[PDB]
Amino acid sequence: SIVTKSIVNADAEARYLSPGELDRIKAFVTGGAARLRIAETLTGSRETIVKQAGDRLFQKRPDIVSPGGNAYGEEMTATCLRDMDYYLRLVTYGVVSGDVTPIEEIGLVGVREMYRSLGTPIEAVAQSVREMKEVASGLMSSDDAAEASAYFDFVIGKMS
Amino acid sequence: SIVTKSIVNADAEARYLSPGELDRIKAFVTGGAARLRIAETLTGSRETIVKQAGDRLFQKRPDIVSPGGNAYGEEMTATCLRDMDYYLRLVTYGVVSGDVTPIEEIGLVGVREMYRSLGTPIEAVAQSVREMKEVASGLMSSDDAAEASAYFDFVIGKMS
Amino acid sequence: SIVTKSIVNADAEARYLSPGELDRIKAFVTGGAARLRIAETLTGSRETIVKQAGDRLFQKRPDIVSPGGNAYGEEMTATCLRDMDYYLRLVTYGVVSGDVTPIEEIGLVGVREMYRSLGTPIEAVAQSVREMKEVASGLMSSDDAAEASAYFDFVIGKMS
Amino acid sequence: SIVTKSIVNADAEARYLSPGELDRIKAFVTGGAARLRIAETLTGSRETIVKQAGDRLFQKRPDIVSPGGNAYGEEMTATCLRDMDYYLRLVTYGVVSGDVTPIEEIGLVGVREMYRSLGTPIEAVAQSVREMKEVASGLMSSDDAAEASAYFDFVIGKMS
Amino acid sequence: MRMFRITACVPSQTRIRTQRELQNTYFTKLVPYDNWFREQQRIMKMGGKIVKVELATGRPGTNAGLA
Amino acid sequence: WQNEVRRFIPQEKKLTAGNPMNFLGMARSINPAANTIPKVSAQNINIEASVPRR
Amino acid sequence: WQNEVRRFIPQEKKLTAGNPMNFLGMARSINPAANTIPKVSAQNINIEASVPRR
Amino acid sequence: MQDAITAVINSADVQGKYLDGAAMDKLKSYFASGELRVRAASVISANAATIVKEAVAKSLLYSDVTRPGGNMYTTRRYAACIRDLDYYLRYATYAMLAGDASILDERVLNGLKETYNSLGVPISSTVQAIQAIKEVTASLVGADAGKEMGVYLDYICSGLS
Amino acid sequence: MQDAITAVINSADVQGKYLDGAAMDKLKSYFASGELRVRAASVISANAATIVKEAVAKSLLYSDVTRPGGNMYTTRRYAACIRDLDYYLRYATYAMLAGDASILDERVLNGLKETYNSLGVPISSTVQAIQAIKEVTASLVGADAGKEMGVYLDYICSGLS
Amino acid sequence: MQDAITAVINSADVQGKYLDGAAMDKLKSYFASGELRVRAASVISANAATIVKEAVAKSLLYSDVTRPGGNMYTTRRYAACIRDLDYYLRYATYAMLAGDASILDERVLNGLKETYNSLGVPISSTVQAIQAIKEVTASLVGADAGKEMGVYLDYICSGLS
Amino acid sequence: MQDAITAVINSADVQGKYLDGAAMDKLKSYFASGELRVRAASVISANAATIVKEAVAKSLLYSDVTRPGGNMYTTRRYAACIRDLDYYLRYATYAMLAGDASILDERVLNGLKETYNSLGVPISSTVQAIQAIKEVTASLVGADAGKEMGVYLDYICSGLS
Amino acid sequence: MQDAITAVINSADVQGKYLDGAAMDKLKSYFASGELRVRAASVISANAATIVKEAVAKSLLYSDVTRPGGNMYTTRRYAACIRDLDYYLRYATYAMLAGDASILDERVLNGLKETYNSLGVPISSTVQAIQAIKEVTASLVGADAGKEMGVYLDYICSGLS
Ligand SMILES: *[C@@H](C)[C@H]1/C(=C/c2[nH]c(/C=C3N=C(/C=C4\NC(=O)C(CC)=C4C)C(C)=C\3CCC(=O)O)c(CCC(=O)O)c2C)NC(=O)[C@@H]1C
Ligand SMILES: *[C@@H](C)[C@H]1/C(=C/c2[nH]c(/C=C3N=C(/C=C4\NC(=O)C(CC)=C4C)C(C)=C\3CCC(=O)O)c(CCC(=O)O)c2C)NC(=O)[C@@H]1C
Ligand SMILES: *[C@@H](C)[C@H]1/C(=C/c2[nH]c(/C=C3N=C(/C=C4\NC(=O)C(CC)=C4C)C(C)=C\3CCC(=O)O)c(CCC(=O)O)c2C)NC(=O)[C@@H]1C
Ligand SMILES: *[C@H](C)[C@H]1/C(=C/c2[nH]c(/C=C3N=C(/C=C4\NC(=O)C(CC)=C4C)C(C)=C\3CCC(=O)O)c(CCC(=O)O)c2C)NC(=O)[C@@H]1C
Ligand SMILES: *[C@H](C)[C@H]1/C(=C/c2[nH]c(/C=C3N=C(/C=C4\NC(=O)C(CC)=C4C)C(C)=C\3CCC(=O)O)c(CCC(=O)O)c2C)NC(=O)[C@@H]1C
Ligand SMILES: *[C@H](C)[C@H]1/C(=C/c2[nH]c(/C=C3N=C(/C=C4\NC(=O)C(CC)=C4C)C(C)=C\3CCC(=O)O)c(CCC(=O)O)c2C)NC(=O)[C@@H]1C
Ligand SMILES: *[C@H](C)[C@H]1/C(=C/c2[nH]c(/C=C3N=C(/C=C4\NC(=O)C(CC)=C4C)C(C)=C\3CCC(=O)O)c(CCC(=O)O)c2C)NC(=O)[C@@H]1C
Ligand SMILES: *[C@H](C)[C@H]1/C(=C/c2[nH]c(/C=C3N=C(/C=C4\NC(=O)C(CC)=C4C)C(C)=C\3CCC(=O)O)c(CCC(=O)O)c2C)NC(=O)[C@@H]1C
């Protein structure tokens, strides 16, 4: 949350909130209607974004789905799409909160260790969330595509 | 009786029989014509409702009339109808008393140990009282049936 | 176990074990091998003893398996045989332990509350384990049948 | 008796005796002839038991019979050996009873307060019954001296 | 267990109670042997008088067999 | 030449102790004699002498 | 006179969000195209020049 | 413990003021709902055992908790669990009579979390057993009275969670 | 820490689903309150020395604790007291901006009881000090923003009590 | 609590199966232990106070604990000390008869360390008194029953220290 | 409990010797003070209702606790606070007659802070009530006799703080 | 910490003699264990990630613990649980090389229960994880080494639970 981030920075500097942080909170608290509209767009298009981005990922990288791959069977593919739904939910949470702190606290700290333990190619997970970003920007309005693509961008950067 | 219950509750905390129960005693002694009408209706139609209640009881649980059952033999079935007639008379005693303590004093203390010693299904006895309640509710006129339903539901609740 | 019941009695009475009681744990540990023989022959013949006991219960009490019954179904007879085998396990545990303590601690405390929640006849399951006693006396040697059938007499008397 | 202890325990837990307890009664009414034989041997040879035990007690603790003491004098030694005969008869009563409760309710309840009012060292009486069991095991068979020393053992434990 | 059947009258010396108190004023009760000395002492501390006491349970003069 | 797919579902579950799966087959082999539905009218039983009178 | 006999299985546990069983049908509807088995034997390859050099 | 009426009285007492119109129309809401609460009380008191019977039948029978190793195994633990569901149903009926959850706060949920943690009692299976009680009593007593019973049983679930 | 929107996000996250309509309604409720929270935070941040000055003058000065030998004596301890009430007012402003009292029992109330017990600090005197801040801020900013500030300040009082 | 026989019964019952040879061997092992524990408990019950009085005479008598200043001087707390040692010897004989130390951490060691910390009881001196009880018991009853009493008294020492 | 004379006896018994000359000097100092202690105890026992009356009047009436919602509100709680101050004055009289502040942590301060923390009793209001008690007592029995009352009421304040 | 060889060295040194025959055959038992322990350590250090990998796959993965709501949920908590199981496996391997659980109760178990209660870590789920490590190590290292590894892992389970 942007309020949580500004409070954390003000607490670290041991001071009250600056007017710049405070009217950023004002601007967010007025303009949150567009962000919740983006969140409803993603929630309504939850299944089709994951489905199309999964198809595009398996076209681009068919060796995560080949024999010997990490996600071979239909159940393993279902776990892949489950992780895609997880990260889409986190991007929706980041769009709503206005800051990447829920995404960091839930699904980006220790993701390298988790996917090392699972054997999963994290560069292919970055490709997966990249195709989710591409599909969402395709079916979303351009300013809304940029607003959601900021958080998609952060998830791509922290995975890769 | 409700007067006896009010006397017992006043004597337990050493009161002088407050108007909060004395108005209830007044309402009971004024409206006793309706419960006497209920009692004479049940007394007049006592045999039809107990036969239909035994019919629905054997419809739902024909174990007891099966050769292994407790009510088998056409004498034990007669004893079943006799016990159900006993509980119907207890219901009439309660509806002329105004409360649940005559049914409690006559036929609910130790009924569990009684039917444990007799080997009968006490849940099927409760089901028989349920069917007697339903047939009496069908025979009686709405709010009178709802008034008798408190005494019936007391019998099922303490039976089960 | 006989040692744990005697030591709970001595602990409550604030004394060491009485020399008669030490003499009787002495008698139990000298005569314990026959109890192990009872346990191993019941473990060897568990399926046939429960076959004969269930079949003769289904002959003797047809109301249990009659329509409307709690043990009417094929499923319901299967879970009845489950309860049969559970009480056989308790009898084997008791003849190993030398006392009634595992039977009462596992399958007798609260069993009336359980079986009245389930609607099952406690006299019928007592008849079942009595039939386990009689077929065990038929199948197993006569001298150890005294101890095994005696613990069966305990569970039928405590259950009925 | 052991039947009295078992019947007190069974009445306390408010049902019939467990087959552990009927096993207690069964083995007691097999071994009662042997117990009666042991008690008859002690009754027949009682005089050498009390006399030799008192003599070696006086050898072990000469302070008790030293002048000014409790047991000093022919009169006081006569009363002391009468106490020795009392205790030996009580242990024979315990042997024929099969437990230690007649021993308790005759001579071991209030014995500490008894000998404190009499000015009698209970540790010296404990040494006295130690020499009692020594002489009894000396002139008694070893398997018989096992249970005789068990009952003398209880006397030593409760009175020491 | 060699119980006593006693009856005694215990008045209230300090409070005027408004509940019914025959049931703990004048009462007949069964008291065990090892509790009876303490119970009779407790009545005599409370100021009540032992109206009557008899040995309903057990036999007097029994040396053994009292448990 | 296959990768064993990570079947997380508890299918082909080993029927452990305490299940009625271990007694379904013996219930089939017993095949209990279910009693017929008795034809008792419960309407024509006069409860004055059919009740035992001893 | 109908009778309600239950089953050895309990009630089915209600499927929740984190369980990938709800995505099994969508994975089937994808049906991802696997890759062909590669027919390379690697005995004929020679590691002195087939490694690139720039 | 306090019901809705004495909760209003105590809140106005701490506020130090008389009963304003919010207190009066909350009291009128309780007086409107009282007949429904009495009827639901009569139905639940009639069917107290059967609600628990069908709820434990449709929630945790023939499952791993009733299997050996599970915590509903043995007759002692099973009857303790049935008495626990009876406690939950009776205290939910009490809270439905009161119009307040203070009885659930002080007589039910006080110490129940660490009691079940010390006992090893499965919290999620207990919660879905309470959910089964909710569905049975909602099918039995009606939609609105079932909704108040459901929100009090869900308060028990949230306190136990 | 946690604010209102992160509380909504975590409440959706523990059950695993996305944000439904009720979550968006709570979000719009917080977005409606955000104007009041921002203006109250600006006012308190502008006047923050005057609030603790008036509170210490109203509740702490000319008493036994500031008479010599007390804990308010020995000017280092007085400056630490002014710093402590400044900390309380600043973190209450943080919780007022947040809409959730998680920062109060994370970064203030964690160990504060045994801090004051080890330092011999009068607990109810501190509680009176935060209540003095409460009516000073209530008179400063208004009834509703003062109500929210009062909620977080007496949350601090209840944690300290 | 639970003994060895009830322990192996419960270890069968957690999987819900009958007893196999892995139960048979240890169950016959406990039966082989048997009469040794019986006669050891018999002779301990014979001279029950005597191990205690030689243990105190060898270890606790004529030292700083019975000298003033020590926590065993005065008749009341030395009475409490010998009552404690009677309790320890009785419950160690209980654990020896049971064949498991469940009665020790169920009946003795629960809260004993913290109540001795509240009373200021010397932990090391109580441990050394238990060692005195152990050595007198081992000199009395023999080697195998002596080391059975030794391992249960050392379990008491390890729990208390 | 303990007084000055049994404190002398216990200090003799810890080191294990008899009563030396300094012990006799401390005893004679107590015997010299005992006339003043008896006179002050008689005056406080005669006027004990007036001390608590004037102390509550000068320290507790017309305050936030006495306004509704506070702890001094609800006449049951009001009379309980009066009874608490009566207990404080009576045990302070016991301590002044004794000569040692052991009766306060043996019979008053044992769990008292935990009691008031669980009860929501204002600690500083109780402390200033004790200050009013000792001021009224020192004004009544004089400065020299009121010195010991000041010692023990301030000991109550230090224990309760 | 100590191993079995320094344990018998210290047991000889505390009573102050040289190495006797009990020390001789205890050392012979440890040297006879020897090769088996060092080979088990070699194969565990070989496939170190394998046991924890399919142990989490066998026990923890695809359950309510790793679903939302559970404690295995979120990637930081997942990596923390992997770190904890690597800790447990490494320290169990260390205790296997030592022959004593001194490194277990001296490096792991002290404070672990209360820090897991502070963090809300499920003790039963960690126990099932340790059982999964026990089963996979039994499948990977053999029978005798597998069962002594199981002794050390369920010593960890008994200490933690
Ligand atoms: C045939 C003679 C009997 C029969 C039995 C019957 N049992 C059930 C169901 C259950 N039985 C148990 C019993 C136990 N749980 C334990 O842990 C132990 C040992 C300590 C026992 C003995 C339980 C818990 C159930 C409930 C579900 C389950 O199987 O776990 C039924 C089914 C009742 C239903 O409504 O489904 C039946 C019919 N029927 C009889 O008449 C005899 C008593
Ligand atoms: C004239 C000399 C100046 C002046 C003084 C002034 N001071 C106060 C108030 C207080 N001063 C103190 C001081 C101390 N606390 C300590 O621990 C120490 C060192 C030992 C000191 C010196 C305190 C605590 C107060 C608060 C009130 C109290 O007595 O507790 C005032 C009063 C302010 C008011 O409005 O209450 C004044 C007037 N003021 C000036 O203008 C001169 C420069
Ligand atoms: C005239 C009516 C009579 C009278 C009254 C009187 N009362 C006080 C003081 C107080 N009265 C209370 C009462 C309550 N506390 C509670 O919690 C409740 C229940 C809701 C009640 C009724 C209290 C707390 C006080 C203390 C002071 C305060 O204002 O809170 C006074 C004042 C006495 C003084 O010296 O301050 C008076 C005068 N006095 C009479 O003579 C008439 C008989
Ligand atoms: C799909 C594009 C890629 C991939 C997927 C894959 N994932 C798993 C298994 C798991 N993934 C997680 C992840 C998370 N847990 C969390 O709490 C969060 C944040 C909210 C995330 C992202 C977890 C825990 C698992 C374990 C199983 C479970 O559901 O708990 C697998 C299965 C691996 C296995 O051995 O079972 C797979 C295959 N694999 C690929 O190749 C793609 C790159
Ligand atoms: C009054 C008409 C004459 C009389 C009375 C007197 N009564 C008592 C005390 C007692 N009274 C009873 C009687 C009852 N207790 C009950 O609970 C009930 C029914 C609900 C009745 C009728 C009892 C049991 C006592 C003794 C216990 C008590 O004090 O409550 C006394 C006191 C006797 C004493 O010595 O304490 C007296 C004197 N005596 C007269 O002179 C009046 C003419
Ligand atoms: C049943 C839903 C599940 C469950 C139950 C279970 N409960 C116990 C035992 C106890 N239950 C309570 C609860 C309460 N006592 C109260 O007085 C109140 C409020 C009025 C409540 C809520 C308590 C205190 C106990 C412990 C006392 C006792 O022994 O009964 C057990 C037994 C645990 C044992 O070790 O015997 C069980 C099994 N567990 C399940 O698996 C069911 C899903
Ligand atoms: C002498 C008149 C008679 C008598 C004495 C006797 N005493 C002991 C040894 C001990 N006595 C005590 C008792 C006390 N502990 C205290 O703290 C106090 C005063 C507060 C007393 C009175 C204790 C503890 C011992 C043991 C030694 C120790 O200091 O711990 C003995 C020795 C017995 C032995 O076996 O060592 C004796 C002989 N006995 C008589 O016969 C005289 C009549
Ligand atoms: C004696 C070995 C050493 C010693 C002990 C000591 N103990 C007490 C008093 C108590 N001891 C206990 C402990 C127990 N309660 C139990 O139920 C059991 C066994 C299961 C034990 C071990 C308790 C509760 C008390 C207090 C009640 C009582 O006195 O019986 C004291 C007295 C403390 C005091 O002065 O108040 C002492 C001194 N201290 C030593 O120095 C000996 C080495």
Side-chain angles (χ1 to χ4, degrees), chain I residues 61-62 66 73-75 78:
Chain I
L61 299 190
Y62 306 106
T66 179
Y73 191 56
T74 69
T75 71
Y78 193 103

Side-chain angles (χ1 to χ4, degrees), chain A residues 75-76 79 86 89 105-111 113-114 117-118, chain L residues 52-53 56 61-62 66-68 73-79 82:
Chain A
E75 178 264 335
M76 278 294 94
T79 59
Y86 273 179
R89 192 183 57 198
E105 284 172 329
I106 300 159
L108 283 171
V109 171
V111 58
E113 302 294 324
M114 175 182 71
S117 160
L118 294 164
Chain L
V52 48
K53 182 179 182 294
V56 178
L61 293 192
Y62 307 98
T66 177
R67 277 194 294 269
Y73 187 49
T74 69
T75 66
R76 178 193 60 81
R77 297 223 284 276
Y78 193 104
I82 295 303

Side-chain angles (χ1 to χ4, degrees), chain D:
Chain D
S1 48
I2 183 161
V3 318
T4 283
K5 281 298 290 181
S6 291
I7 208 168
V8 159
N9 294 296
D11 186 34
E13 59 203 356
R15 85 281 191 274
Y16 295 87
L17 281 79
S18 81
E21 272 92 4
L22 303 308
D23 175 89
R24 308 288 83 82
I25 317 306
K26 174 66 74 176
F28 173 70
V29 304
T30 58
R35 291 188 177 273
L36 199 46
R37 164 184 56 93
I38 298 157
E40 267 288 339
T41 53
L42 267 70
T43 302
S45 57
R46 58 160 183 272
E47 289 87 3
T48 179
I49 293 285
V50 44
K51 200 67 68 176
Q52 290 179 358
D55 285 21
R56 67 190 69 246
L57 174 74
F58 290 168
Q59 186 262 325
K60 250 79 84 178
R61 290 277 303 276
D63 58 334
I64 311 300
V65 77
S66 302
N70 199 185
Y72 155 74
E74 52 91 20
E75 166 65 72
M76 291 291 108
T77 49
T79 61
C80 180
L81 292 175
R82 188 221 56 183
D83 269 33
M84 297 276 276
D85 197 6
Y86 276 165
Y87 257 48
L88 188 269
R89 194 169 91 265
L90 259 57
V91 182
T92 61
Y93 290 143
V95 169
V96 297
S97 74
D99 61 346
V100 295
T101 51
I103 290 172
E104 293 185 323
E105 71 195 357
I106 295 289
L108 265 298
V109 165
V111 59
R112 293 177 185 273
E113 198 271 341
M114 155 77 84
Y115 280 168
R116 174 158 293 105
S117 168
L118 289 187
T120 292
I122 52 174
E123 70 279 16
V125 202
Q127 288 302 111
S128 164
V129 287
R130 276 193 180 87
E131 293 120 11
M132 282 281 187
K133 68 103 175 178
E134 283 294 324
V135 181
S137 66
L139 59 91
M140 200 61 213
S141 312
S142 173
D143 48 354
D144 302 10
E147 67 92 26
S149 71
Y151 281 5
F152 275 135
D153 175 306
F154 172 79
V155 173
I156 292 161
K158 191 59 68 70
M159 195 261 297
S160 171

Side-chain angles (χ1 to χ4, degrees), chain J residues 53 56-57 60-63 65-68 72-76 78:
Chain J
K53 73 110 173 178
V56 182
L60 291 198
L61 242 51
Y62 308 98
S63 39
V65 281
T66 186
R67 279 192 294 268
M72 187 260 278
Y73 172 72
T74 63
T75 59
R76 181 199 56 84
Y78 178 36

Side-chain angles (χ1 to χ4, degrees), chain C residues 84-114:
Chain C
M84 297 246 175
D85 199 8
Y86 274 157
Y87 287 129
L88 196 66
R89 289 181 61 248
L90 292 176
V91 172
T92 57
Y93 290 154
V95 301
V96 157
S97 80
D99 205 357
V100 299
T101 293
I103 306 110
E104 63 186 1
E105 270 318 295
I106 293 146
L108 285 178
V109 162
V111 77
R112 309 205 197 282
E113 308 304 319
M114 162 195 297

Side-chain angles (χ1 to χ4, degrees), chain J residues 31-101:
Chain J
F31 271 107
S33 67
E35 301 88 1
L36 172 67
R37 299 156 180 281
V38 170
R39 64 175 65 92
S42 180
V43 295
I44 284 174
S45 89
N47 56 10
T50 317
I51 313 103
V52 180
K53 73 110 173 178
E54 320 327 333
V56 182
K58 283 167 69 175
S59 269
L60 291 198
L61 242 51
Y62 308 98
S63 39
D64 51 1
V65 281
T66 186
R67 279 192 294 268
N71 207 21
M72 187 260 278
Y73 172 72
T74 63
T75 59
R76 181 199 56 84
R77 71 180 70 185
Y78 178 36
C81 198
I82 65 168
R83 177 166 67 253
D84 283 11
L85 293 183
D86 287 329
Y87 267 3
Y88 292 131
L89 178 63
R90 171 186 163 186
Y91 279 54
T93 302
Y94 286 172
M96 176 262 289
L97 268 178
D100 197 0

